[PDB]
Amino acid sequence: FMVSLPRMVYPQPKVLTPCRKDVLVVTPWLAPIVWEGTFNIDILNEQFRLQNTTIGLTVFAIKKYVAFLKLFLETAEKHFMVGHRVHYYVFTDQPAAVPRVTLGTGRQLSVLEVRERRFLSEVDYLVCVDVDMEFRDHVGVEILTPLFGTLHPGFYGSSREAFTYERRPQSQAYIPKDEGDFYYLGGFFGGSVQEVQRLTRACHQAMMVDQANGIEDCSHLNKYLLRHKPTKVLSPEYLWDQQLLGWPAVLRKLRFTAVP
Ligand SMILES: [Hg+2]
Ligand SMILES: [Hg+2]
Ligand SMILES: [Hg+2]
Ligand SMILES: [Hg+2]
């Protein structure tokens, strides 16, 4: 049951004006592709707050990568799901090195030491990101959906033959030259807990099969998302490297970026 939205005043959507003429904003399976100018965040925030949505954010910080946690968390506090309930899950081999970062209300952090079902009872969505990154602009409930992937910032303009998919037929991750929608990158993906756990289970099983066959890019992610199409795709706004790629006109905002 979803309750009624309150009265809200905002500009009328214009049926005979595209919001972007420079980029594709829907996939051929009718999933939105999330670019700045496609969404009204006020509408979406209402829809999500009325469901009291909790977002989990998972990050692996091992060895020297623990050093990126402070900036990662500070900037998430500024930009990630602000106004909603957030549970950060930091997987680390160095629990005592996790910095003590001050969090907004309704936001919590758990540290899990490394050498499942918990997520189902704790959060509605899971977002899995790399820790060596920083938020620079809004990353909010516009991304939330059963299953989403993000466009590789190095390849969004490329033809699919150029995508660095797995190309050896003996690999479970094999995608032929004539197949492929997009090249997704593993730095930023998510969905419902159920969907994200399906994805990671399928990648893990295919990885075991390849290792069994003596075969060792985000190639499994890409095979999964070819075969189980995401319900949203995020633009490279959500996973950028300004050092390597600059700031092209097609990017109106740079939301989540590499840290040198
Ligand atoms: Hg628009
Ligand atoms: Hg995850
Ligand atoms: Hg991840
Ligand atoms: Hg995967």
Curated annotation (Swiss-Prot):
Expressed at high levels in testis. Also expressed in pancreas, uterus and lung and salivary gland. The soluble form derives from the membrane form by proteolytic processing. Belongs to the glycosyltransferase 6 family. UDP-N-acetyl-alpha-D-galactosamine binds at residues 60-62, 65, 130-132. Changing residue 133 to T/V: Alters substrate specificity so that both UDP-N-acetyl-D-galactosamine and UDP-galactose are utilized. GO terms for molecular function: antigen binding; fucosylgalactoside 3-alpha-galactosyltransferase activity; glycoprotein-fucosylgalactoside alpha-N-acetylgalactosaminyltransferase activity; manganese ion binding; nucleotide binding. Residues 3-260 are lumenal. The conserved DXD motif is involved in cofactor binding. The manganese ion interacts with the beta-phosphate group of UDP and may also have a role in catalysis. The lineage of its organism: Eukaryota, Metazoa, Chordata, Craniata, Vertebrata. This is Histo-blood group ABO system transferase. One of its GO terms (biological process) is protein glycosylation. The chain holds residues 64 to 345 of 354 of the full protein. It comes from the Eukaryota. Changing residue 187 to A: In allele Bw08. Keywords: Blood group antigen, Glycoprotein, Glycosyltransferase, Golgi apparatus, Manganese, Membrane, Metal-binding, Secreted, Signal-anchor, Transferase, Transmembrane, Transmembrane helix. The gene is ABO. One of its GO terms (cellular component) is Golgi cisterna membrane. Binds 1 Mn(2+) ion per subunit. It catalyses: an alpha-L-fucosyl-(1->2)-beta-D-galactosyl derivative + UDP-N-acetyl-alpha-D-galactosamine = an N-acetyl-alpha-D-galactosaminyl-(1->3)-[alpha-L-fucosyl-(1->2)]-beta-D-galactosyl derivative + UDP + H(+); an alpha-L-fucosyl-(1->2)-beta-D-galactosyl derivative + UDP-alpha-D-galactose = an alpha-D-galactosyl-(1->3)-[alpha-L-fucosyl-(1->2)]-beta-D-galactosyl derivative + UDP + H(+). Glycans are attached at residue 52. It comes from Homo sapiens. Its EC number is 2.4.1.40, 2.4.1.37. The keyword Transmembrane helix applies. Disulfide bonds: none annotated.
